[PDB]
């Protein structure tokens, strides 16, 4: 952890290749705006220093902290201009504040074009030409758009991207092979980026402990067979791994993650049967495998849970004398008997059990007070099971697009101050929870649904925190980690909100629009739908779909026209007349 030369110690630990990749991710994350060429430059510069220090640990700059080094290289960069570079105010500090400054500027939604994709053939040609520039470009482009991306998983995905391109590219029918396999990879990477952003927010906004509790639960359900001691240890090393990653210490993050996988494999007999799979694999595949490992079968011979946490004389004492160890052990015991609960439910239940001990342990007769505690959970369980039922039914009924449309209407009325891009993006993702999770038998849905919503609500929370516009979002996002979903579910339409008056044909662009694929076109209809509802939040569904209908219709009639621009300043104000006659 603290070596005479850190940069050398990590280069050695990690190998030149992962080290180059981790360093390129570090810069792409800290400086999302900067062109590829500057990052490559800085990466090279940092790698050569690394080489120099391995060679001879007394070399200049070898005794620096990694923060110092990344900071020194950056700061000799106001050279290759800082016009867009608004934050070399950061270079005005020294460490640790210098580094904290760079960190505080990571941007959850940098102004960038949507990561465009080449046609299959072009994508294949690019990869054959030059693999390094190819995957350097990929790390760069994914890191800068997702500045908290779990860094070793990002290396893993580059290597997944590489296996796919190898396989598809030589088939002479590229797109049909490639794009389906790529579009999947994208979805999974976006899931992983959101899971990590949630780990980082938990740590940052709620404290190490909130991530520890969360992790304790998840590992308890995945490794129901291991003992508490071994589960606490994994939880402890894994919280240090995420603290480092989430703070931009990726080199130390990746070395530590690798240390932990190694430890897990060295100890699989006492952890899970399912580890055989993973432990046979190379570094990244092995840590990934472990990262998403299906839960082990819960062991045969466990006593009833009431026996340790209701019946025992010593319940109040353990709660009073060793709160954390005692509540931990609770989360462990309870979580491991229930892999059909979401981690968030199990944490709400852990919360309720705690509030019960707190209330009841200060009475005359605590037992009589907390006797019904495990039983008193049932409502809290029932609450999210109905949300799943009602919303999956609807999804099955409506299909993707119309289920998204309904969620867009729902969410825009609950929190209409939220910006239109954020509401489009949130709703569409909520819509993705539907395709992912509604196809699983009822047992499996809850974990899938509620834990996925938790990730999508955190996206909302982090988009909003930067530019707070909705008191209700601020409240739901700041009160709990764990009650976020029920907090947002409970929200009725906001009747405080002053409707925006029409904004004159906002989507009558000089029509770049007409170049958009159906996908991006759906986004445009959805953006309009959101704007309609902000204008007319008491409008009926049919009235909303009539107006959208004349929007799509308008796009066809004036994208079918040479001088596209012309009938857009002309049809739009008749859409306005269409719109007032239909929504009054």
Automatic annotation (TrEMBL):
Cell compartments where the protein resides: Secreted
Organism: Oryctolagus cuniculus
GO cellular component: blood microparticle; endoplasmic reticulum; extracellular exosome; Golgi apparatus; protein-containing complex
PROSITE patterns from the UniProt entry: ALBUMIN_1, ALBUMIN_2
Name under which the protein is recorded: Albumin
Residue positions binding Zn(2+): 67, 247, 249
Domain Albumin, chain residue ranges per copy: 1-187, 188-379, 380-577
Keyword vocabulary terms for this entry: Calcium, Cleavage on pair of basic residues, Copper, Disulfide bond, Lipid-binding, Metal-binding, Methylation, Phosphoprotein, Repeat, Secreted, Signal, Zinc
Residue positions binding Cu cation: 3
Amino-acid positions noted as binding Ca(2+) 2 in the UniProt annotation, renumbered to this chain: 13, 255, 259
Disulfide bond residue pairs: 53-62, 75-91, 90-101, 124-169, 168-177, 200-246, 245-253, 265-279, 278-289, 316-361, 360-369, 392-438, 437-448, 461-477, 476-487, 514-559, 558-567
Biological process terms in GO annotation: bilirubin transport; cellular response to calcium ion starvation; negative regulation of mitochondrial depolarization
InterPro entries named in the record: ALB/AFP/VDB, Serum_albumin-like, Serum_albumin/AFP/Afamin, Serum_albumin_CS, Serum_albumin_N
GO molecular function term, any single one: enterobactin binding
Lineage of source species: Eukaryota, Metazoa, Chordata, Craniata, Vertebrata
Residues that coordinate or bind (4Z,15Z)-bilirubin IXalpha: 240
Binding, Ca(2+) 1: 6, 244, 252
Domain of life the protein comes from: Eukaryota
